[PDB]
Design a binder for this molecule. Sequence first.
Ligand code: YUY
Ligand code: YUY
Ligand code: YUV
Ligand code: YUV
Ligand code: NAG
Ligand code: NAG
Ligand code: CA
Ligand code: CA
Lengths: 622, 309
Amino acid sequence: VNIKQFLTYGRLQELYCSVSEKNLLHTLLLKKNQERQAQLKFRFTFHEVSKVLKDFLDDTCKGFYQKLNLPDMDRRCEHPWRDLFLWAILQNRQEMANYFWAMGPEAVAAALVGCKIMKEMAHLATEAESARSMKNAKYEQFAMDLFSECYSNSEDRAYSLLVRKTCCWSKATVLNIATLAEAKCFFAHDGVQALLTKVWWGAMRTDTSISRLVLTFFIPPLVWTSLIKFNPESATFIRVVLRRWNRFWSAPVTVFMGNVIMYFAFLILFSYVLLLDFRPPPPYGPSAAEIILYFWVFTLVLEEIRQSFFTDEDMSILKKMKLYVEDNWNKCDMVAISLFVVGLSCRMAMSTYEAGRTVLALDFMVFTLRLIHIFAIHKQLGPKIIIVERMIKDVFFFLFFLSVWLIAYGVTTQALLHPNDPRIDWVFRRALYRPYLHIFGQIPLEEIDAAKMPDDNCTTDVQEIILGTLPPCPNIYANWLVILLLVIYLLVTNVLLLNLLIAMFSYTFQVVQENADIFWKFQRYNLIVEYHSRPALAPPFIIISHITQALLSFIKDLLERELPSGLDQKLMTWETVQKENYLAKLEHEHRESSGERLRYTSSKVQTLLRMVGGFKDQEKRM
Amino acid sequence: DMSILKKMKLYVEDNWNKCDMVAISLFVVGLSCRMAMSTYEAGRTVLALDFMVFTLRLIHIFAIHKQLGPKIIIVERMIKDVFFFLFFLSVWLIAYGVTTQALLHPNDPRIDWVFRRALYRPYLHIFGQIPLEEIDAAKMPDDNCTTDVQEIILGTLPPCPNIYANWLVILLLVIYLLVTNVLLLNLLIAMFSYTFQVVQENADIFWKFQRYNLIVEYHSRPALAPPFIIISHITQALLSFIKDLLERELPSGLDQKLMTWETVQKENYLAKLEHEHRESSGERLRYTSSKVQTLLRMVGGFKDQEKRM
Ligand SMILES: C[C@@H]1CC[C@@]2(OC1)O[C@H]1C[C@H]3[C@@H]4CC=C5C[C@@H](OCC[C@H](CO)CO[C@@H]6O[C@H](CO)[C@@H](O[C@H]7O[C@H](CO)[C@@H](O)[C@H](O)[C@H]7O)[C@H](O)[C@H]6O)CC[C@]5(C)[C@H]4CC[C@]3(C)[C@H]1[C@@H]2C
Ligand SMILES: C[C@@H]1CC[C@@]2(OC1)O[C@H]1C[C@H]3[C@@H]4CC=C5C[C@@H](OCC[C@H](CO)CO[C@@H]6O[C@H](CO)[C@@H](O[C@H]7O[C@H](CO)[C@@H](O)[C@H](O)[C@H]7O)[C@H](O)[C@H]6O)CC[C@]5(C)[C@H]4CC[C@]3(C)[C@H]1[C@@H]2C
Ligand SMILES: C[C@@H]1CC[C@@]2(OC1)O[C@H]1C[C@H]3[C@@H]4CC=C5C[C@@H](O)CC[C@]5(C)[C@H]4CC[C@]3(C)[C@H]1[C@@H]2C
Ligand SMILES: C[C@@H]1CC[C@@]2(OC1)O[C@H]1C[C@H]3[C@@H]4CC=C5C[C@@H](O)CC[C@]5(C)[C@H]4CC[C@]3(C)[C@H]1[C@@H]2C
Ligand SMILES: *[C@@H]1O[C@H](CO)[C@@H](O)[C@H](O)[C@H]1NC(C)=O
Ligand SMILES: *[C@@H]1O[C@H](CO)[C@@H](O)[C@H](O)[C@H]1NC(C)=O
Ligand SMILES: [Ca+2]
Ligand SMILES: [Ca+2]
């Protein structure tokens, strides 16, 4: 059977129409068909398949079947193994999909696509057993093992395989598909990390010492010395010195360094303006340092705009905005920008001056916390960010129990101690703020224990309590009960509930620390990619880079590169050979396994018993 | 006798050696400053720090005991954990402290008090020092306070804390207490627990290496303890001018006998390894499958020959 001749588009559509009607793919195709019928022979059509694929990849299946809209039904599929793999993946058939992947040309990209589709469908997950089998798909492992084989083979063709635009997946890069699939374990591969290190250092050699690089950063003229080794490849002298300067000052590591230093400078200036040089409204004018801070934040806004609208390429504006706002650091920045603008606006008026100063203090808090993202560069600091996020989630869930318990205890103690205090603010103080402070050692027994209550001048008159002339007299009717409740609260809260939260923290830390390497390598990938696409200048100076880019656009890649047809075909054949070698080694390993040997021995012993019995009977005939 | 530079490099490679060097330098600087009236207090301060260094130097003798040795390594790794935790702690404390200083004392110009309220007070919150009389308006005393900047700088009266939005200051303090005191402190403690677990898994090996190092260190030391060690030093110098348990040179016959003995021991060890490998389950399975294959082929041939008859 020749699959190239066997699989026509009509045949493929017939296969898509022959879905068992008990699996998720049939339901999804039914929903697509119902939507199409509402908006406007074969039960299902390639339009429905394209829409279903769009709900899992949304960029990869660009005109897989919409190109001709519908293609000729007697025409053979241009990518038969790709189509068969996609069809066998959409319906949770993993063995068949494994076979189709083993016969397919672009296997790393196919495996990453399969892992993405498996996780998205396990998010859909109509059933639960299918969802569990689809959680353990092991396609990212196929991609990782094939790429390990490829990287061990050549280590230079592996990088090109990482960055080349695929032919079977609509010019999508393997790294693009891994990002779409969120394949954290693939990004943690040694080959991917090596390519990331090569991108990180740029023109310099990756073995460059940190001390030499920092010292050359702080002494720019020393870059023309041989202190920093660079990778191979009047007017000439100027050109070569400019080339050396640009190659050093364009590397993502130096851009990162400069951005970190200028962010420290920005925080220092922000703190100076907020704490020492915050002047009255424009009647007495903002200080010059404040205007410098305004310009700095304006350049930050320009950088945000560049990242949200003019990032790297041309897509839908809405798609680019969605990609921008999907990053949590991006929305953190947006919050900081909005807070600064509101603060500045309120500060410009006398009646809102204090509110503006308050909002600006909160904005400094937000910017300082924003500074945290640079810790992903270090293995010992990166994973702790993820730990802190999960631990914040743990705190959020613990807060339900804490709030219920504190409401009960605080209202009971407020009723027992100050039944005649009408003021609501003091009600909430004594009911929640004081019990919360008990957790951290703040136990004011002079307000709770009668024997410790001072002889202060106190009133029982409600009007005098409301007026605030004298503090209310605490009720000591049954003070033993108040003290017993405080003892119980101290035990329960401070030991039991606090250590329940701490045990939750410990479990979270243990779970993240088990996978610390993978998490940090994914973080490092994201940080290196972020600073590789950034302009070489740090804000405020980034205004120069923005102006230069705009002027270049008006007047007139390391990753995701397009290859010549011959080199592309050579790479595809090389990867196919690597996949064949990997599968052959897997088969050989399987054959020599203990279970396989046991099965072979038992079967052959059975055959030997039968044939030896026959031979013995024949001999006994003689 | 080696290269002088090699011996110095070997000396300074030991952390206890550089600890001692720090202690000696501190004592010398302290004594020198103490010799002058204008540097007397600085000398006393440096000598106090030197006592601290010497007392911590005393820790090295704990390697002699199995229950004390490994704890030194645990403490070193835990200090590294603290160093890495300090980045998060410093960033968070800078954010919170500057925000609260701006909210509470926007008119206080003095930088020392800025840094006090921005980092020293929030750090002390971690250890139960929560002065609500400076943060909560309802707990603020009726003390005699000024809003004049000149009077604040002069120090005549304490500055009046700003109570513009005190609910926000209190909410920030509540959030800081939760985040820092529970979350971040227990993140550091979980790091500590992981470090302790990793070292305690290999406690025996670490302590035995420590014991080796300590025994070797005190085997090569002169028999007299300082100050008295001056007598041993003078005796050694006099012996050098006028005129080993480990690392000993053997006669040629005994050396050859030892080499042959070790070769025989290695041969016995390798033979036992080979015998263990042969009788393993996997090897037996491989042998049985291969011989069953051979038996199938040869029995088929024999059966065909019999069927010829
Ligand atoms: C292992 C486990 C640990 C936890 C726990 O169980 C065991 O421990 C138990 C111990 C127990 C507690 C044991 C004892 C008591 C005392 C008892 O009061 C007796 C009531 C009498 C009558 O009403 C009040 O007396 C008098 O009051 C006056 C004030 O009103 C004081 O005058 C002061 O007045 C003014 C003070 O402002 C000022 O003029 C002066 O300062 C002074 O003149 C007198 O001096 C004092 O004599 C109340 C109960 C209490 C606190 C127990 C509570 C429960 C425990 C904590 C257990 C735990 C589960
Ligand atoms: C489970 C979880 C725990 C954590 C938390 O969430 C839930 O708990 C919540 C509880 C909440 C708090 C609940 C209540 C409040 C009170 C509120 O003030 C109301 C504002 C008004 C108006 O501006 C001020 O009032 C008045 O001020 C005056 C001072 O200025 C006082 O006069 C004093 O003046 C001088 C004091 O020097 C002296 O003359 C005397 O001593 C006295 O005359 C009055 O007596 C008082 O009436 C501010 C907010 C706060 C603290 C909440 C903050 C957030 C919580 C902790 C929640 C947690 C997330
Ligand atoms: C963590 C939750 C948030 C929401 C909430 O409980 C904790 O906060 C508390 C703060 C309370 C305020 C505190 C002070 C005052 C001033 C007083 O003159 C009138 C009542 C009012 C507004 C109170 C109304 C009820 C409020 C919002 C409580 C509310 C359930
Ligand atoms: C753990 C870090 C060490 C470094 C540092 O932050 C914590 O220490 C802080 C102590 C600060 C001092 C404290 C007191 C004074 C006296 C005052 O009249 C002038 C300013 C000055 C020197 C301050 C300058 C800034 C300093 C070094 C801060 C500096 C970022
Ligand atoms: C309490 O107020 C009354 C009002 O007359 C006064 O006489 C008395 O001295 C006050 N006591 C205290 C402790 O302030
Ligand atoms: C505060 O200082 C003024 C100066 O006249 C004085 O009259 C007043 O008694 C002082 N109050 C306190 C509480 O020291
Ligand atoms: Ca951003
Ligand atoms: Ca020494």
